[PDB]
């Protein structure tokens, strides 16, 4: 499996044409699963889920979707609340591809999008696996913005290699995962005019008047499916105290916390994450 | 596998002769694992771990040990802090059977004993799996004693079938697991003079001057092994807020919480519990 | 100041004529404050606030309102979601008395009423003082229903003096406050057909299509006033973990917790409560 | 009251002669209270408590002590665990001044010193008021080191005005409190060779064989006096989740949390802090 071999495009309608890029693997496996990546600058499906797609594609039909504003998906200069925007894009893709009810796997911003989709289109979402998720997290103890969010904002204002490296170092427990090569690759993607347009567009929308759609901790008592919350104990972006309202209020919730793990569970605990996900989604 | 086929006795020395009863299965599997049951009146290894021993014995050499005061182990009228007493008994058994470093699985009181053993004899304890554990739990929000502990104390003072049924109903999320047959079986065992002697002996020791040995939330930062904390979200004996100091301070901690699950994780989520335990202890 | 000297009646329109009983004191004082009592069987304004009304009336114009279903207020057999019902009645009284913007003090169910009032009629509510409040509390760790709520439910089904004393004992840290005289007085009021009809109607009103109106932890991020949350560390009805969403999300929140204090802060810590309330509402 | 009019020196024996600087006020008043300042670079008694000493001196005989390594107290290059070192110095002063049992007020590192003093010399410590305290805090959710501690460590390695201003900005909610004048004054004191030597020595003293002396959350269950914990909801050095073990385990604990308040409660909420402290210590 390569970036190129798995690369697919679809055109959907969200207030006009929207090109989505995604990766497909494990075609012919009985169970489809959709993967939604995190929202750090330069993030995309293939790099976010590199330690996971090959393994999950042994069990499932994997669709790893670049969210709008990321990777090779369209990078519009303006949009509404990001998770509802991305959920509308995903609904478009579900309809185009003829998907019925599909489990979703989402880290951080992608977890927010998975939840918004599961709330707005409840018949179309199956089991959820949510890693350090945004949206349904509310940091009952951590002052907002967190150290992690502050470093993301600093990059947005001053998009330098130094500021991107700083934000990446608070994503992980083992800072040796942040190699000069990773920093170089992410900075090249994050600093394009189009990517900076998408990060400028993103800025407005979470602070805009559409904000209530983002406060999904208010809504997840409505989720009827099993939901597996996965957290790194050392997550400095969406810290562990953000799990508590979702764990309490989602009837069929589970939580798994990994010690010695930051915000990139799917990378830092890739084997344990892969095994939890395979078992939770039914072994495929 | 039956109670009778797996039944074993050993005599160890803890301030004199002490007969321990245990169950053995999976002899010849490379990895030995020790199971330590919860401390509810009438509790013992076989009934506590009935949905687990057969499954774990496919992968591991299982030793399910009746703690002192329970099942067919000696029921002395007096002892020190219960977890250190039970840990000294287990050290005696480890030495008699020639065990080296062995993983421990413990629910509630048995989790306390596993931790006390791992702290006092660190070279002899491997990975720990601790379900709604006592000792290393400290209920940061729940007023003590909890609803669960109060019902246990009420039974001790007034050892009636009605008071035992009341305590068993706050052990589980699905109160239909508390059948008239379970109540009858547990009451027959719990109400013997010898069992009431052991429950009278137990009363003193947690309230005695030896109490600090029980406050294992103060000590678990010393544990060097991986530790899997497992909780029922609806545990009314040792509630979920009791997990937080251990999760923070044990370097290689993990936590798994099951929604729609009380204090008997190994019964109410037996399949998920079995799978977590098998994977965590290395697949055997 | 006596029950009789302070006693007042109003008739307001709440889906038809509704008689409200209240106590008025400190008529000389410029700053009006409304007091809303707890919802335990046989509760009313004068008894709930017996250690507070005289002290507060030195500083403030006190209006202590018997909520619908309690004391000498109307006890309808049918009504909607209780806190919205009680808030509508209070709104009717505000309009009749020509009140503008007024601070509210409420314990438990009265705290829920104060919050519902402050959300539904935001310009009419000033500073809030809320003691072990319902509605904006969500018990992130404690399994629901709590020991306290279960004992209230048991009394509703089996309204005996024994079941009332059992509920009253889990409302305080110092059980000696639950005198035979207090139990006899509360039970004589609680056991009337009119009072029991109200108690059951209040219970049923929390479950139905509009249960969202009770989930005020979703809404209090919108409160613009200073809010003083006051909790007893040992509250077994609305435990301390219920404070966290409100403390995090109300911009001008404060929290005071008293150790060695249960669910009746205004009784158990009356002097500390009186001083906190006088200072917080501006000394009068 | 001026810095100069209140200024006092003592020489105590702490593994050799130790000069202590302190401020004395309210010499007429019967109730003595000791104030212990925070440990940020360039901190001292008079500046830490500039909004408190005059108000408290109306009620109490105030002793505001420059802790070793700060202000005009000796700045040794070598010492043991800092809070035990500072507590031993305070004990020396207690004995010299003929003090019996005296209440202590301490923020952050000073709070840690107050607790270590109250544990090591239990008969000498009265009521405690502890604001965002170190030592008895354990951050159950926040990854350590916190944003605040990391900025202090960065200043220690690179003692620039820019790194001091960055640390000071995460100590308050209202960043306008960090005036150019305050930064210039704190940096001129912090940057001296004597002060930097002390700052580094204090940092190193928390890591070594006796690190247990810093883990005071293990020990405060033994405190018999009333303890008022005071926190800013937005404390980014010692965050609010650090309050929970102390609140649970100190029998006569109270907690006050201020919304829209960081790590300098005594400055940011000076009037509310002064009133809480005067009432809690018995009005004087
Ligand atoms: P995950 O890592 O996707 O979540 C990171 C935080 C997402 C929310 C960001 C809010 C501030 C955005 C600033 C835009 C430059
Ligand atoms: P697990 O279910 O084993 O833990 C139950 C509580 C254990 C501690 C009991 C303390 C009170 C004992 C009363 C003796 C009658
Ligand atoms: P405060 O002590 O007023 O709050 C107690 C709980 C009030 C709501 C109870 C609803 C469920 C139980 C009702 C039984 C009729
Ligand atoms: P308060 O603001 O006094 O507490 C701040 C932290 C004090 C302890 C810091 C230890 C680690 C960093 C030291 C750097 C030299």
Give Cα separations from B179 to B61, B117, B144, B165 (angstroms).
31, 34, 28, 9
Q: How many CA atoms lie within 13 A of D221 on its CB side?
A: 13
Give Cα separations from C42 to C156, C163, C185, C189 (angstroms).
12, 13, 8, 5
Dmax (CA) for chain C in angstroms is 47
> Which DSSP letter does residue B216 get?
G
Residues C164, C40: Cα–Cα separation, whole Å:
9
Question: Do residues B170 and B239 make contact, with C-beta atoms less than 8 angstroms apart?
Answer: no
User: Out of A251, A260, A275, whose CB is closest to B259?
Assistant: A251
Chain B contact present for A22, CB below 8 A: no
User: For ligand 4, is residue D133 a contact (CB within 6 Å)?
Assistant: no
Phi/psi of residue B272, nearest 5 degrees: -65, -40
Question: Do residues D273 and D230 make contact, with C-beta atoms less than 8 angstroms apart?
Answer: yes
DSSP three-state, residue B157:
helix
Residue C248, min C-alpha distance to chain A (Å): 6
| Atom 14 in ligand 1: residue holding the nearest Cα | A203
Which of A244, A246, A247, A250 is best to mutate for the C interface (most C CBs within 10 A)?
A: A244
| Atom 12 in ligand 2: residue holding the nearest Cα | B203
User: For ligand 4, is residue D134 a contact (CB within 6 Å)?
Assistant: yes
Our answer to whether residue C263 is catalytic in this structure is yes
Active-site choice (C21, C23, C79, C263): C263
Q: Which ligand is nearest to the CA of C264?
A: 3
User: For ligand 4, is residue D168 a contact (CB within 6 Å)?
Assistant: no
Neighbour-count burial of D167, counting CB atoms closer than 10 A to its CB (0-12 exposed, 13-18 middle, 19+ buried)? buried
Q: Where are the alpha helices (DSSP H) in chain B?
A: 3-6, 45-48, 53-56, 82-97, 109-120, 147-157, 161-169, 180-190, 193-207, 244-249, 265-268, 270-280
DSSP three-state, residue B162:
helix
Residues C122, C105: Cα–Cα separation, whole Å:
15
User: For ligand 1, is residue A71 a contact (CB within 6 Å)?
Assistant: no
Tell whether residue C52 is among the known ligand binding residues: no
Give Cα separations from A134 to A82, B88, D264 (angstroms).
11, 47, 30
> Which DSSP letter does residue B231 get?
E
D6 Cα distance to chain centroid = 19
User: Out of A150, A241, A262, whose CB is closest to D141?
Assistant: A241
Question: Do residues A219 and A119 make contact, with C-beta atoms less than 8 angstroms apart?
Answer: yes
Q: What is the resolution of this structure in A?
A: 1.6
Which residues of chain D form beta strands (DSSP E)? 7-13, 17-25, 32-36, 61-65, 102-107, 125-131, 227-232, 253-258
Which residues of D are less than 8 Å from C245 in CB distance?
none
Both tokens of residue B180? 């008239």
Both tokens of residue B91? 């050290």
Q: Which ligand is nearest to the CA of B214?
A: 2
Residue D90, min C-alpha distance to chain A (Å): 33
Round the CA-based radius of gyration of chain B to a whole number and report it: 17
Hey, are the CB atoms on D141 and A240 less than 8 Å from each other?
Answer: yes
H or E element at residue D110: helix D109-120
D207 Cα distance to chain centroid = 20
Question: Do residues D263 and D237 make contact, with C-beta atoms less than 8 angstroms apart?
Answer: yes
> Which DSSP letter does residue A216 get?
G
D28 Cα distance to chain centroid = 25
Residues C240, D253: Cα–Cα separation, whole Å:
14
- Write the DSSP assignment of D180-244 as a string of letters: HHHHHHHHHHHTSHHHHHHHHHHHHTTSSTTGGGG-GGGTGGG--S-EEEEEETT-SSS-GGGGH
> Which DSSP letter does residue B69 get?
T
Residues 241-280 of C with CB under 8 A from A: 244-245, 247-249
User: For ligand 1, is residue A26 a contact (CB within 6 Å)?
Assistant: no
Closest CA to B190 of B69, B83, B73, B89: B69
Dmax (CA) for chain A in angstroms is 46
Residues B192, D279: Cα–Cα separation, whole Å:
56
**Cβ neighbours of residue A131 closer than 8 Å, sequence gap 6 or more:** A105, A106, A107, A108, A111, A230, A231, A265, A266, A273
Give helix D161-169 / helix D180-190 axis angle, nearest 10°: 120
Chain A contact present for D239, CB below 8 A: yes
Question: Do residues D36 and D65 make contact, with C-beta atoms less than 8 angstroms apart?
Answer: yes
Both tokens of residue B60? 């591991």
Both tokens of residue B225? 């092994």
Residues 116-155 of B with CB under 8 A from C: 140-143, 147, 150
Question: Do residues D107 and D265 make contact, with C-beta atoms less than 8 angstroms apart?
Answer: yes
Residues C20, C91: Cα–Cα separation, whole Å:
12
Closest ligand 1 atom to A156 CA: 15
User: For ligand 4, is residue D139 a contact (CB within 6 Å)?
Assistant: no
**Cβ neighbours of residue D4 closer than 8 Å, sequence gap 6 or more:** none
Question: Do residues A246 and A217 make contact, with C-beta atoms less than 8 angstroms apart?
Answer: yes
Domain ranges of chain B: 1-284
| Atom 12 in ligand 1: residue holding the nearest Cα | A203
Closest CA to A152 of A39, A14, A275: A39
Please provide the distance, in angstroms rounded to a whole number, between the alpha carbons at the two ends of chain B. Answer: 19
Residues A196, C154: Cα–Cα separation, whole Å:
61
Residues A227, C178: Cα–Cα separation, whole Å:
44
User: For ligand 4, is residue D199 a contact (CB within 6 Å)?
Assistant: yes
A198 Cα distance to chain centroid = 16
H or E element at residue C127: strand C125-131
User: Out of D140, D221, D247, whose CB is closest to B245?
Assistant: D140
Question: Do residues B269 and B259 make contact, with C-beta atoms less than 8 angstroms apart?
Answer: no
Which of D143, D235, D237, D247 is best to mutate for the A interface (most A CBs within 10 A)?
A: D143
Residues A226, A282: Cα–Cα separation, whole Å:
11
Which of D220, D249, D255, D274 is best to mutate for the C interface (most C CBs within 10 A)?
A: D255
Residues D266, D245: Cα–Cα separation, whole Å:
23
Residues C246, C118: Cα–Cα separation, whole Å:
14
Chain C contact present for B236, CB below 8 A: yes
Question: Do residues A262 and A173 make contact, with C-beta atoms less than 8 angstroms apart?
Answer: yes
Tell whether residue C163 is among the known ligand binding residues: no
């Amino acid at each position: 499996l390569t970036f190129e071999s798995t690369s697919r495009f679809a055109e959907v309608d969200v207030d006009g044409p929207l090109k989505l890029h995604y990766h497909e693997a494990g075609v012919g496996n009985d169970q489809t699963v959709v993967l939604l990546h995190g929202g750090g600058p330069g993030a995309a499906s293939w790099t976010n889920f590199s330690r996971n797609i090959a393994v999950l594609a042994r069990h499932f039909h994997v669709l790893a979707v670049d969210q709008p504003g990321y990777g090779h998906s369209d990078k519009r200069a303006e949009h509404g609340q990001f998770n509802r925007y991305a959920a509308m894009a995903l609904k478009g893709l579900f309809d185009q591809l003829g998907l019925g009810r599909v489990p979703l796997v989402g880290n951080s911003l992608g977890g927010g999008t998975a939840v918004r989709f599961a709330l707005d289109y409840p018949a179309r979402a199956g089991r959820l696996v949510l890693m350090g998720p945004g949206g349904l997290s509310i940091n009952l103890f951590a002052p907002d913005p967190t150290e992690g969010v502050k470093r993301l904002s600093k990059f947005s204002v001053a998009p330098t290699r130094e500021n991107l490296e700083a934000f990446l170092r608070v994503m992980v427990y083992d800072k040796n995962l942040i190699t000069p090569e990773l920093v170089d690759q992410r900075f090249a993607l994050a600093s394009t005019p189009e990517s900076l347009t998408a990060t400028r567009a993103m800025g407005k929308s979470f602070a805009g008047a559409d904000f209530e759609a983002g406060m999904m901790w208010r809504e997840v008592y409505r989720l009827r499916q099993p939901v597996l919350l996965i957290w790194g104990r050392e997550d400095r972006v969406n810290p562990l105290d953000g799990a508590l309202v979702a764990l309490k209020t989602i009837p069929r919730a589970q939580l798994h916390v990994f010690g010695q793990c930051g915000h990139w569970v799917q990378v830092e605990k890739f084997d344990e994450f892969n095994k939890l996900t395979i078992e939770f989604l039914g072994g495929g």
